[PDB]
Amino acid sequence: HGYVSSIQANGQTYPGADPHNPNPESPGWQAENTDLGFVEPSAFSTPAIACHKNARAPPAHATVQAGSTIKLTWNTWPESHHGPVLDYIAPCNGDCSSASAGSLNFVKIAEKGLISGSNPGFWAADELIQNGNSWEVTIPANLAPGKYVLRHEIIALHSAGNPNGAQAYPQCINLEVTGGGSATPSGQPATSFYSPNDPGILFNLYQSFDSYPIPGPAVW
Ligand SMILES: [Cu+2]
């Protein structure tokens, strides 16, 4: 349990989207993750998996040049919640202030899963804790200018050995990308990412293994 509480682009720092205090200057999507909780695998076929429960587009955006870095800080992250950290992006039409999360066509732009070991092993989520509860996302240098939605996610696997036990923590952020990129992605809705029986979703931390198959589509 946790949420993205701060968003940095050089510098400019923005507050994250606290579900108990919707804030007009935050570029984080305004969701009903009031427990700072997760979306369960049975909901991976519903719009909740895009930007979290009942998420609504915010009226602010972070501005960032293609090729530069966004640094995201979580308010906290528990050591128990081992799992991958994944980043996706979708173009957004219009000013992105009325966009439906379920209609966004995302591509994956970065991922990290198991780093080393097993039972339970050391994971991207553990690195995120060691970094200071923070993660960096590089916006692809050839991404064309425009309005986009960044979807940053941890999938916690501490109960994922049981059916419906994985816990997905998506957090969406409105971006305006600037610069000299030329390419636009051809993505798919977030309901296409994951299934309850994917090997990286139904995954037992508490045994020996030497790899982890990261779920979702290929990095763009
Ligand atoms: Cu939790």
Side-chain angles (χ1 to χ4, degrees), residues 71 112 124-136:
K71 186 169 174 171
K112 190 180 301 187
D126 300 287
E127 166 194 343
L128 181 148
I129 296 166
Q130 288 186 349
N131 287 342
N133 300 332
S134 58
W135 202 253
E136 291 81 32

Side-chain angles (χ1 to χ4, degrees), residues 63-77:
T63 290
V64 56
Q65 178 167 11
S68 188
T69 299
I70 298 164
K71 186 169 174 171
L72 306 175
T73 300
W74 291 72
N75 73 311
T76 189
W77 197 246

